[PDB]
């Protein structure tokens, strides 16, 4: 079965940096594109990051580019996110996913069980 285990991420003041860490399991990890998402409490999830099988191609949402850095360990099956810079508008709880094999739309997704960033004082 596919599995994917969110870990790190947490609490952190204003200004300051967490590494969001995704263990998978089940697949064969390179053959797949990666993402994180974030859902804000009242608001859509929301794509955050995405990585391409190899790690060749990335892509970043416009409010977190240069903040935030998506990468994978091929050898490790991990996806991490490195976030520095983090700011109130960051608080969520974030999921990664695997993107499903081409041509599947994103109903074929597997997530993560999600894990909270908290900004805060």
């Known amino acids: 079965q596919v599995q994917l285990v969110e870990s790190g991420g947490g609490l952190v003041q204003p200004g300051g940096s967490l590494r969001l860490s995704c263990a998978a399991s089940?697949?064969?990890?390179?053959?797949?594109?990666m993402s994180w998402f974030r859902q804000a409490p009242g608001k859509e999830r929301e794509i955050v990051s995405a990585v391409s099988g190899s790690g060749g191609s990335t892509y970043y949402a416009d409010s977190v580019r240069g903040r935030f850095t998506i990468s994978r360990d091929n050898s490790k099956n991990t996806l991490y996110l490195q976030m520095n810079s983090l700011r109130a508008e960051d608080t969520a709880v974030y999921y990664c996913?695997?993107?499903?094999?081409?041509?599947?739309?994103?109903?074929?997704?597997?997530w993560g069980q999600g894990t909270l960033v908290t900004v805060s004082s």
């Open positions: 996913a695997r993107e499903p094999r081409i041509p599947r739309p994103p109903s074929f997704d597997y």
């Open positions: 089940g697949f064969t990890f390179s053959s797949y594109a």
